[PDB]
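For reproducibility, we list the full input for the calcium ion complex.
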Amino acid sequence: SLLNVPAGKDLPEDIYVVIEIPANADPIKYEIDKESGALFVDRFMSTAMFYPCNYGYINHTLSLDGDPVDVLVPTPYPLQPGSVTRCRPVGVLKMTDEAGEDAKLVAVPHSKLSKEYDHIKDVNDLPELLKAQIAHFFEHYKDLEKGKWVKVEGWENAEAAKAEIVASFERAKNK
Amino acid sequence: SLLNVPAGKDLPEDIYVVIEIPANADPIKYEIDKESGALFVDRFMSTAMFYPCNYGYINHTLSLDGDPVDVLVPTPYPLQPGSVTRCRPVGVLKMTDEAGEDAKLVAVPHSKLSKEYDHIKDVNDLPELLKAQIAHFFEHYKDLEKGKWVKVEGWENAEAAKAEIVASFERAKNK
Amino acid sequence: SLLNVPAGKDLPEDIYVVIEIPANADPIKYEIDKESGALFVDRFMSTAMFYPCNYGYINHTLSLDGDPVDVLVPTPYPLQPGSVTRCRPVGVLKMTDEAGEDAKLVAVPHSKLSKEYDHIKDVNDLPELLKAQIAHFFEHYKDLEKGKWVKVEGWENAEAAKAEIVASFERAKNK
Amino acid sequence: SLLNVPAGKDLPEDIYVVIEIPANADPIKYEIDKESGALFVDRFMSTAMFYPCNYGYINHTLSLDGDPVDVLVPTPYPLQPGSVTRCRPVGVLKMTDEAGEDAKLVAVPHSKLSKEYDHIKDVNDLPELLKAQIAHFFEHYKDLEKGKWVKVEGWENAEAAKAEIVASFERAKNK
Amino acid sequence: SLLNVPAGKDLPEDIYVVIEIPANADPIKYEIDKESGALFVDRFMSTAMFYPCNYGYINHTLSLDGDPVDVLVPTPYPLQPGSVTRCRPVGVLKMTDEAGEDAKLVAVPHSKLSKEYDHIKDVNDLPELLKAQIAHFFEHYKDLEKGKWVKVEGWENAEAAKAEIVASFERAKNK
Amino acid sequence: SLLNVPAGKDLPEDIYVVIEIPANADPIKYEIDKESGALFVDRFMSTAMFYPCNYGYINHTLSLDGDPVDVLVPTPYPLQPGSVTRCRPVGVLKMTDEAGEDAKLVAVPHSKLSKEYDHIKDVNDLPELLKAQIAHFFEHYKDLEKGKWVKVEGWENAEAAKAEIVASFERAKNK
Ligand SMILES: [Ca+2]
Ligand SMILES: [Ca+2]
Ligand SMILES: [Ca+2]
Ligand SMILES: [Ca+2]
Ligand SMILES: [Ca+2]
Ligand SMILES: [Ca+2]
Ligand SMILES: [Ca+2]
Ligand SMILES: [Ca+2]
Ligand SMILES: [Ca+2]
Ligand SMILES: [Ca+2]
Ligand SMILES: [Ca+2]
Ligand SMILES: [Ca+2]
Ligand SMILES: [Ca+2]
Ligand SMILES: [Ca+2]
Ligand SMILES: [Ca+2]
Ligand SMILES: [Ca+2]
Ligand SMILES: [Ca+2]
Ligand SMILES: [Ca+2]
Ligand SMILES: [Ca+2]
Ligand SMILES: [Ca+2]
Ligand SMILES: [Ca+2]
Ligand SMILES: [Ca+2]
Ligand SMILES: [Ca+2]
Ligand SMILES: [Ca+2]
Ligand SMILES: [Ca+2]
Ligand SMILES: [Ca+2]
Ligand SMILES: [Ca+2]
Ligand SMILES: [Ca+2]
Ligand SMILES: [Ca+2]
Ligand SMILES: [Ca+2]
Ligand SMILES: [Cl-]
Ligand SMILES: [Cl-]
Ligand SMILES: [Cl-]
Ligand SMILES: [Cl-]
Ligand SMILES: [Cl-]
Ligand SMILES: [Cl-]
Ligand SMILES: [Cl-]
Ligand SMILES: [Cl-]
Ligand SMILES: [Cl-]
Ligand SMILES: [Cl-]
Ligand SMILES: [Cl-]
Ligand SMILES: [Cl-]
Ligand SMILES: [Cl-]
Ligand SMILES: [Cl-]
Ligand SMILES: [Cl-]
Ligand SMILES: [Cl-]
Ligand SMILES: [Cl-]
Ligand SMILES: [Cl-]
Ligand code: NA
Ligand code: NA
Ligand code: NA
Ligand code: NA
Ligand code: NA
Ligand code: NA
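The corresponding predicted structure, in tokenized form, follows.
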């Protein structure tokens, strides 16, 4: 099932991301259920916003927030919910929510899937417009949901992203 | 797998529906296979009709027709086949087919997913147009399939819907 | 051409809206060009937001901002850019932008097109979620465009909407 | 504008059809307005049905019902509303509605656009499933609209279709 | 899971195909992973081409190339990735790639799903345009991927397709 | 109508392109008719290929092939057929077809529509993958259409593109 997919072929540079929400999609927040492996509806979003990239997680990781590491994956065409993509981390957006710190990584399709993103090596290589759009999304998408809130802090580099992956992989392994 | 998803967090008011057919979709009737959990094509429909809401079933239920309880779920945007949505029953359409009685429940997204449908408490609160469209769909979608037929009987209330859920949950539990 | 379509069969209660941007669409702001009648791209929006309803204008009207009256039209399914829909005003959102006051009307499909929206008679009958989503959209969609900004003021009723239509129709007639 | 497009390069075998409603579309009945050339919404259909082929009319024709000849055009992919396709008539479905007789022609893409439909020479060459789906659509799509109704009579051949085209072209020419 | 679906109810005439890539889709080559049953991205294709039919495989088969038998399934509407369709083989396209011979079967929806394809009994009954489009796709889709290449050889009949199914089913059974 | 749209606000650097075919679309080749301004179907393409960018022309230009200048416009989201986009030329692909030389320009959305493409100043700044995909498309899309053929020659720079625009604008002006 999706529950058995590796974290990656060679973490932290070569990872797999399980997609929950496609790019360019309707505002339905899906989440894989840890017990069943099934895709559940978490929310029908109240804001007229959409996730700016495909969105999902790295299996077999455990962040300090109790969930697997969250990742945004830009692609040329939107991915299927429940599919798995090989990727390479390039940066991370830090933010604070009602529960504490959080982080949203950005990882690009691995070179074996396409050469398209090979030129993006670190966070400064992501388009400025894309980074601004991502920050604005996380800052505002919960504006109409009482109880949940997000304050965006700022971007960090690929080494910071990779550190989150390794820390969270080792935490899961040792759980 | 989808085979392991609960009937609901607190039946009959708080249920899960496993979606087989999205709203606003092409006329492909999908059904989850009980053995494998996979989504199979049942039919490429002959009529130029579409399911009027997302359509699926309540897992771990057994109706007198030998299948899990059938449910229609209105949503703001169409759901993914194979996804699971938390919902609240509000009414039921009774009908007769080539095999006997049947029923098609209507359940709305649970308040935790969105406040949108909180105002729909019972069958009289569903829009008249939606109810008429649903009845017309079930009356006619099999008009060109020899062997299968449906005669729509009429709507009943949320208590009737809830009774079907409980009866069919207890039948499954006791199988 | 679109340039020759009436303001309405019986203003201000029975109007036509020329659609520029569909509901549930990609974030491309289109505008009809007054000279040619053609649909031009105004902007590829920087924010990950979408217009919450179909959006367009009432032909043969002139508001104090120099443009025809702006209208949002909820529909069951998204409309085609460049199409024309008969509608009935129900409310108006007032706002301030870099140039001055503005207003975004809401008008629902006319009863002759469908009975669906007949129950919405005034602004209090629009769903609260929809109104909040609309306000949030206009408050934030220009957050990443330097030079353009919007501060949302608040909703007014169908009589206020109708007054804007009549004032702007008479201004155009007298230009 | 669309108002100036010919009936055809060589009627009745080689015609142009102005498309109003795409195949595989949402249930929005569009109609071109004779005065403006603009695409208007006629109806948001109440039934959960869709037009089985692209649907439109032959310009510069006048049938006994006061409108241009109505035509269904099967294509491999859905057409744009307002576009024009070169086609060849192959058959006609006769029907009675609240106003009198009507007819819905079927015309296939001309050989110059594609060889795909060259094998369909007459009404017996259309797939049986397609013909049944078309008849069922026209029989039922107005089932929930009070005031409008349709009783389907039966299919006739390409010569019958061609006769309707010629009669209606000559009626328009002589208006 | 998808891993447990039969090869077919009555091979080689009555088979199941697990769909990986829908018809009319974006150029994302998906493949089910043998270990997990999950849908992985194999490639973001470099060419502006799309798979001409739905594409997938027959479970519990093993061809000489080490993978299950590959099958193209024409349908009236595109299928969901990960869904399963009952079908009937009608022909096979032979080709050579960087690793050796290959074959791409064509199988049509089984009569129980629809009567639409019952008239296609053998390879000569497939439309010429469809066969040419399929051959051209496989000849060119890898033109921009270094390392992978395809030279199309030619079509063979339903008996040849059926022989591949049986040989590959027996090879798997005996592994 | 579309017939009255300028070539551009300040040719050759600041042009308008009238879109005929969206990005990421079905394989339907549309062309605006010079007489009517309407969008006609030219071809239902036989190959399983799609135009790699939005495609259209510069109005009020006349190339040596008798038609307005042809332009590809990359955008973040596909454009509407018949819409008009302000753009800036960056390069040109030269090719030979059954009638003689041809050229396909590439122009990016103007800075006023978005900052996204400001970094693309000349042909070397276009992604290599995109350029290869475009060349491969034009080399192969007519492979199954008898009578029409294309041999791709190679790319030239923004000055070459601009020269084509000016030459063809002056030819039209002087017709
Ligand atoms: Ca979308
Ligand atoms: Ca998560
Ligand atoms: Ca969080
Ligand atoms: Ca997290
Ligand atoms: Ca915030
Ligand atoms: Ca649909
Ligand atoms: Ca069922
Ligand atoms: Ca039944
Ligand atoms: Ca049942
Ligand atoms: Ca019936
Ligand atoms: Ca959308
Ligand atoms: Ca405006
Ligand atoms: Ca303004
Ligand atoms: Ca205004
Ligand atoms: Ca603001
Ligand atoms: Ca559709
Ligand atoms: Ca008509
Ligand atoms: Ca009629
Ligand atoms: Ca008629
Ligand atoms: Ca009838
Ligand atoms: Ca497509
Ligand atoms: Ca395979
Ligand atoms: Ca191979
Ligand atoms: Ca193979
Ligand atoms: Ca080759
Ligand atoms: Ca597409
Ligand atoms: Ca051209
Ligand atoms: Ca040419
Ligand atoms: Ca040219
Ligand atoms: Ca060539
Ligand atoms: Cl792992
Ligand atoms: Cl993306
Ligand atoms: Cl990589
Ligand atoms: Cl349970
Ligand atoms: Cl729905
Ligand atoms: Cl609830
Ligand atoms: Cl007027
Ligand atoms: Cl809407
Ligand atoms: Cl009204
Ligand atoms: Cl004419
Ligand atoms: Cl069609
Ligand atoms: Cl022909
Ligand atoms: Cl088996
Ligand atoms: Cl297909
Ligand atoms: Cl069969
Ligand atoms: Cl000009
Ligand atoms: Cl593009
Ligand atoms: Cl510019
Ligand atoms: Na909030
Ligand atoms: Na039947
Ligand atoms: Na701004
Ligand atoms: Na009726
Ligand atoms: Na290659
Ligand atoms: Na050719």
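Helices of chain A lie at 128-140, 158-173. Chain A has one domain: 1-175. Both points were considered when choosing residues for closer inspection.
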